[PDB]
Amino acid sequence: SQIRQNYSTEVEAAVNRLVNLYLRASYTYLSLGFYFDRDDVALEGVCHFFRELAEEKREGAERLLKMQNQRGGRALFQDLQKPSQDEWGTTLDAMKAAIVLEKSLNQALLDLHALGSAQADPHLCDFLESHFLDEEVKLIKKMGDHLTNIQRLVQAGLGEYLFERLTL
Amino acid sequence: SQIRQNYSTEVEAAVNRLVNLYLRASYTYLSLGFYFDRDDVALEGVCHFFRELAEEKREGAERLLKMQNQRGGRALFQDLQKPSQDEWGTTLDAMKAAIVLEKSLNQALLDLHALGSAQADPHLCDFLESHFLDEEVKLIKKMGDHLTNIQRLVQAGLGEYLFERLTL
Amino acid sequence: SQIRQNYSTEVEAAVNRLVNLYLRASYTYLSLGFYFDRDDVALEGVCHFFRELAEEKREGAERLLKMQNQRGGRALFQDLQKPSQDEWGTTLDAMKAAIVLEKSLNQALLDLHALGSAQADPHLCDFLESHFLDEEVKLIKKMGDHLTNIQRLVQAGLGEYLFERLTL
Amino acid sequence: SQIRQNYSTEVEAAVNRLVNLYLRASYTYLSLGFYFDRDDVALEGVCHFFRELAEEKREGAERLLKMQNQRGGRALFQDLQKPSQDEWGTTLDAMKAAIVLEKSLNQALLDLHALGSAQADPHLCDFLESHFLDEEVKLIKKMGDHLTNIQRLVQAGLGEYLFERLTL
Amino acid sequence: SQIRQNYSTEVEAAVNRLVNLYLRASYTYLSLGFYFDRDDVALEGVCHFFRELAEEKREGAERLLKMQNQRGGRALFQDLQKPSQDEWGTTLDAMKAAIVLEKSLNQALLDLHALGSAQADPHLCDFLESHFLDEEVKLIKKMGDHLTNIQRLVQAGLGEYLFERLTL
Ligand SMILES: Cc1cccc(C)c1O
Ligand SMILES: Cc1cccc(C)c1O
Ligand SMILES: Cc1cccc(C)c1O
């Protein structure tokens, strides 16, 4: 690219991989959201929580794709793997799955930051710090808070209802 | 009728029957509503839920009667049978009874749609699709969601109170 | 009932009967209204007059049902008999039928008031006086005024049109 | 056409025919409107009624032409036959002629719907149901209501005047 | 009195007694209210419920005193007996005590109405019907509704908390 400067092929490839991970996360959250919208699950607050996260993850992917082009890299898309489960169990099970997912995204962000530092690419490092790393820490803290509250509420049916009504 | 066109006697009769079913449903919901207003039941959210449905079903009947006249058919009214119960048990029992009732109305709508299709009466088919079929699907989904939440809440007294307070 | 006080079984039963009479009146007015909406009758002011009365009578029934519960009585519903006619003739015939109907409701109100007085139930007596007796006197006077005007207008077709256009 | 999909030549031709029928109806209503504007007829409400219908029918034709292009069919225009009469008699005669005209348009709509169903063309079927079939049923009901009122008013001159003044 | 007309000494005395009963009820509610404000009871919604009732009963007494003077009777005050309890137990116990109290006031109202009827004093009868009898029926129905909800909630501590939070 006529504009490409200080942008390694290793970072370019890792950015494409991260786009795939964010889109896969978005898809997972779409599945989680609609599972809680089932008439035999019917926890609307939980459905809304996950549908909002599907949107956030898609936005993250789009920000990464915008950055790829700004740097003169070339977006390459791969298949989006279907989510790991078809049914997500209880709100507790779902929130545990979500925190696992977020920690995996966060690790990928940290890995890419480390690569950027090794390649002396401060624009990449700043980009990740500014738009992703703090968002992930905040989200993981929120999920941990939710998990603790869900666990303390498990009369499991009553607890699940109250969490959805009074927290979400 | 000077205006009657493509409107079979079979559909005309079936529309009159459907008016009766909607008015009977409205009456059933009136009974459900006032049962939950009893001082020894006293679940105001549940009373409101069913009184609103009584109004919706009456409106449905009135829309059908308007359509009967628009097509040049002749409204014929029959007795409105009293509701199947005098006392409706718990919120769970009542919501189960309501979903049974709605599924029976929906089946009648589907039967009339099938008759309209067989008689090549697209105005009737459109009318039902536009004003009734989706309303019924939405309502049945809502009732199913409510049933699931009520069931998960059954400390049955506490659960019944919380559902009325926090959902309805 | 824990709340029931000075409320006789005779009044409780008579209130349930009166609910049935009001709902039957509402149904009769629904039939009258839609008859005047027929394309071969087509008197919109008359249709509106009777549909408004259907609503008023239903509201009366609902007020009675509310009162039944306030007093600790138990609502019991019976079948709603179909209206006495399928076709209602001229506006004159219909208005005569309506005044007959209202006078029958008024007599039932007066009978219930008399029962309340005999049972020394002043809350019932006040309730009827406050919400029903004057409403009925006003409505019957209005119908009598309408009958007189309709009769003076009978060139019967022209008169019927003018009454609908200029009074209703 | 590059865009044409599931759109039969039979439906394409029938749509062109229907455009012609709607434009012919519009022309007929233009003639009716100006006849009632003659100084020796002079019924302004009747003139307005028919001029409004001329506009509605032209709009219907334009909607059909828009749809023809949306589907990749090719609009073909034919002569517009002059209306069946040069003078339209009384308001009663004119309203009878209008209801005959509307019933013929409605039959053409029903015929085209049947063709669409036979050709498994649900976009066409929906289009007609959504924009034409209910409009026609409503209009025919209104005309039938008007005919009944005009007939009841026939002192024919006085009745014609009053209908124009008080209904139209 | 120069103004006294159709106002018996029996009714005058009974009105003074009723003033005392209303003021005693107000005092009882003051005691109930402050009991629920104790730091070792601490149910603010319940405190508010009873303090509002203390105000309503005082207003009732003041209305009776105003009426006594309007009729030319002479207000005579007696001691106000201290409430029947110093401590009121649970919300359930308190609501039971309140409904007992209200039923006793209602019986006194009914007794005075009967006296008025026997003395042919229609102003008194109207006064009681208009300002007291329906208020009492409404309040007793509300208390019965509350009792039913409290009973269904008895995990008694949790139920008491939830009723205070979500109903009161
Ligand atoms: C491509 C994709 C997959 C899953 C969820 C979303 C929102 C999305 O855009
Ligand atoms: C139950 C019932 C019967 C007839 C008319 C009305 C409005 C109604 O609610
Ligand atoms: C005199 C009296 C006693 C108790 C409560 C109140 C409000 C009151 O005025």
- Residues with Cβ within 8 Å of C67's Cβ and at least 6 positions away in sequence, in order, are C15, C127
Mind telling me how many Å the CA of D69 is from chain C's nearest CA?
Answer: 38
The token pair that represents C161 in the structure block: 């049109």
Torsion (CA) B103, B105, B107, B109 in degrees, nearest 10: -140
**DSSP secondary structure, chain E, as one string:** --S--S--HHHHHHHHHHHHHHHHHHHHHHHHHHHHTSTTT--HHHHHHHHHHHHHHHHHHHHHHHHHHHHT--------PPPS-S---SHHHHHHHHHHHHHHHHHHHHHHHHHHHHTT-HHHHHHHIIIIIHHHHHHHHHHHHHHHHHHHH--HHHHHHHHHHHT-
Cβ neighbours for A83, distance < 8 A, ≥ 6 positions apart: A24, A27, A28, A31, A32
Taking the C-alpha atoms of residue C54 and residue C49, their distance in angstroms, rounded to an integer, is 9
The CATH number assigned to the domain holding C54 equals 1.20.1260.10
Cβ-Cβ contacts under 8 Å between C and D: the total is 37
What is each CA distance from A136 to A19, A60, A133, D22, in whole angstroms?
15, 11, 5, 62
Ramachandran area for residue D87 (φ above 0: left; ψ -120 to 50: alpha; else beta): beta
Three-state secondary-structure class, residue A153: helix
In a mutagenesis test of the B interface, which of E146, E152, E167 is the best target, namely the one with the most B β-carbons within 10 Å? E152
The range of the structural domain enclosing residue C55 comes to 1-168
- A143 and A135 Cβ atoms separated by less than 8 Å: no
Structure tokens at E44: 């603010």
Of B136, B114, B115, B113, nearest to B126 by C-alpha is B113
CA E22/CA E17 separation, integer angstroms? 9
D85 burial type by CB count under 10 A (0-12 exposed, 13-18 middle, 19+ buried): middle
Q: Tell me C87's DSSP state.
A: -
φ and ψ at B136, to 5 degrees? -65, -45
Ligand 1 neighbours (beta carbon < 6 A)? A 23, 26-27, 30, 54, 58, 80
Q: Is residue A60 within 8 Å of A50, Cβ to Cβ? A: no
Phi, psi for residue D109 in degrees, rounded to 5: -60, -45
Spatial contact of D102 and D140, defined as CB atoms under 8 Å apart:
yes
Residues in contact with C128: Cβ distance below 8 Å, sequence separation at least 6, in sequence order: C109, C112, C113, C116
Q: Report the C-alpha gap between B69 and C49 in whole angstroms.
A: 18
Which helix or strand (DSSP H or E) is residue C12 part of? helix C9-36
Give dist(CA A67, CA A73) in Å, integer: 9
Let me know: does D74 contact D68? Beta carbons within 8 Å: yes
Helix (H, G, I), strand (E, B), or coil: what is residue C120?
A: coil
Residues E157 and E162: their CA atoms lie apart, in Å, by: 9
- Binding-site residues of E, in ranges, read 52, 55-56, 59, 62
From residue D160, how far is each of A65, A91, B64, C115, D96 by CA, in Å?
74, 73, 33, 56, 14
Burial class of residue A90 in the structure, from the number of CB atoms within 10 Å of its CB (0-12 exposed, 13-18 middle, 19+ buried): middle
b or e along E89-114 (b: 16 or more beta carbons within 10 Å of the residue's beta carbon)? ebbbebbbbbbebbbebbebbbebbe
Query: How many angstroms separate the most distant Cα atoms in chain A?
Result: 64
Cβ atoms of residues C36 and C47 within 8 Å: yes
Return the bridge partners of B80, or none.
C80
Of B40, B74, B76, the CB nearest to C1: B40
Residues 6+ apart with CB under 8 A from C123: C6, C71, E129, E133, E134, E137
Whole-angstrom distance between the N-terminal and C-terminal Cα of chain E? 47
Question: The tokens 């009648």 sit on which residue?
Answer: B108
A10, A12, A16, A22: CA torsion to nearest 10: 90
Please say whether the beta carbons of E91 and E168 come within 8 A: no
Residue C83 main-chain phi, psi, to 5 deg: -60, 160
Q: To 5 degrees, how large is the angle CA A57–CA A62–CA A63?
A: 95
Amino acid sitting at position A41:
V
Task: Say if CB A111 and CB A73 are below 8 A apart.
Answer: no
Helices (H), chain A: 9-36, 44-71, 91-118, 122-128, 134-153, 156-166
Distance, in Å, from the CA atom of D134 to the CA atom of A61, rounded to the nearest integer, reads 47
Cβ–Cβ gap C157/D158 under 8 Å? no
What letter does residue D69 receive in the DSSP assignment? H
* Residue type (1 letter), E60: G
Give the distance from residue E36's alpha carbon to the nearest chain B alpha carbon, in angstroms: 22
First to last CA, chain C: 47
Question: Nearest Cβ partner of E166 from B39, B157, B165?
Answer: B165
Which residues lie below 8 Å from residue C153, measured CB to CB, with a gap of 6+?
Answer: C159, C160, C162, C163
Closest CA to C165 of C61, C45, C84, C82: C45
Question: Which chain B residues are closer than 8 Å to A160 by Cβ?
Answer: 152
Contact: B161, E149; criterion CB under 8 Å: yes
Distances (CA, A) of E39 to B69, C116, D78, E89, E159: 68, 49, 92, 14, 19
E140: how many CB neighbours lie within 10 A of its CB? 25
Query: Per the structure block, which two tokens stand in for B7?
Result: 């409107």
- What is the rounded (10 degree) CA torsion for E120, E123, E127, E129? 50
Q: Reduce the DSSP state of residue D2 to 3 states and report it.
A: coil
Residue A69 CA to residue A72 CA, distance in Å, equals 5
Amino acid letter, residue A28: T
CB A26 within 8 A of CB A130: no
- CA–CA dist E23, E8 (Å, integer): 23
Pair D22, D57: CB distance under 8 Å: yes
Residue type, D9: T
Q: Which residues of C are annotated as a binding site for Fe cation?
A: 52, 55-56, 59, 62
Give dist(CA E82, CA E61) in Å, integer. 17
Q: Which of C57, C62, C52, C3 is CA-nearest to residue C25? A: C57
The span from the CA of A32 to the CA of A47, in Å, is: 7
Tokens coding C111: 């009978």
* Cα(B78)–Cα(B63) distance, integer angstroms: 17
Question: What Cα–Cα distance (Å) separates residue B19 from each residue in B57, B68, B83, B103?
Answer: 9, 10, 16, 16
* Half-sphere exposure at residue E78, Cβ-oriented, CA atoms within 13 angstroms: 13
- The resolution in Å comes to 1.5
Integer Cα distance of C6 and C45 in angstroms: 45
Where does C37-90 have alpha helices with state H? Answer: 44-71
Q: Return the structure tokens found at A117.
A: 């530092």
Taking each helix axis as running N to C, give the angle between helix D91-118 and helix D156-166, from 0 to 180 degrees, rounded to the nearest 10: 60
Beta carbons of D80 and D20 less than 8 angstroms apart = yes
Q: For residue D60, count CB atoms less than 10 angstroms from its CB and return exposed for 0-12, middle for 13-18, buried for 19 or more.
A: buried
Domains in chain A: how many in total? Answer: 1
| CB distance C55 to C65 below 8 Å | no
Q: Kindly report the backbone phi and psi dihedral angles of residue B122, in degrees, each rounded to the nearest multiple of 5, phi listed first.
A: -70, -25
d(CA C72, CA C74): 7
Distance from CA of E116 to the nearest CA of B (A): 31
Q: Is C80 helix (H, G, I), strand (E, B) or coil?
A: strand
Q: Which residues 83-112 of chain E have a CB within 8 Å of chain C?
A: 99, 103, 106-107, 110
Q: CA B43, CA B163: separation in Å to the nearest integer?
A: 10
For ligand 3, atom 3: residue with the closest CA = E27
C35-40: long-range contacts at Cβ-Cβ below 8 A with a sequence spacing of 24 or more?
Answer: C35/B75, C35/C87, C35/C88, C35/C94, C36/C88, C36/C91, C36/C94, C37/B66, C37/B69, C38/B69, C38/B74, C39/B1, C39/B2, C39/B3, C39/B69, C39/B72, C39/D141, C39/D144, C39/D145, C39/D148, C40/B1, C40/B2, C40/D144, C40/D148
Separation of alpha carbons C160 and D159, rounded Å: 12
Q: How far, in Å, CA of B156 to CA of B158, rounded? A: 6
Contact E29, E50 (CB under 8 A): yes
Q: CA of B45: which chain E residue's CA is closest?
A: E167
Angle at A89 between CA B154 and CA A104, to 5 degrees: 140
- What single-letter DSSP state applies at residue C81? P
Substitution target in C34, C40, C76 with the highest count of B β-carbons within 10 Å is C34
Contact D93, D150 (CB under 8 A): no
Tokens of A76: 């390459």
Provide Rg for chain C, Cα atoms: 18
Can you tell me which residue has the tokens 């998960």? B152
Q: Do chains D and A touch (3 or more CB pairs under 8 A)?
A: no
Beta bridge partners, C80, equal: B80
Angle, CA E92 vertex, CA E90 and CA E96 arms, to 5°:
120
E136 contacts: CB under 8 Å, gap ≥ 6: E102, E105, E106, E109
Contact by Cβ (8 Å): D116, D13: no
Distances (CA, A) of D124 to A4, C43, D132, E95: 52, 37, 11, 67
DSSP for chain B? --S--S--HHHHHHHHHHHHHHHHHHHHHHHHHHHHTSTTT--HHHHHHHHHHHHHHHHHHHHHHHHHHHHT-------BPPPS-S---SHHHHHHHHHHHHHHHHHHHHHHHHHHHHTT-HHHHHHHIIIIIHHHHHHHHHHHHHHHHHHHH--HHHHHHHHHHHT-
Could you tell me how far CA C46 lies from the centroid of its own chain?
Answer: 16
Q: Which of A165, A161, A38 is CA-nearest to residue A92?
A: A161
From its phi and psi, is residue E82 left (phi > 0), alpha (psi between -120 and 50) or beta? Answer: beta
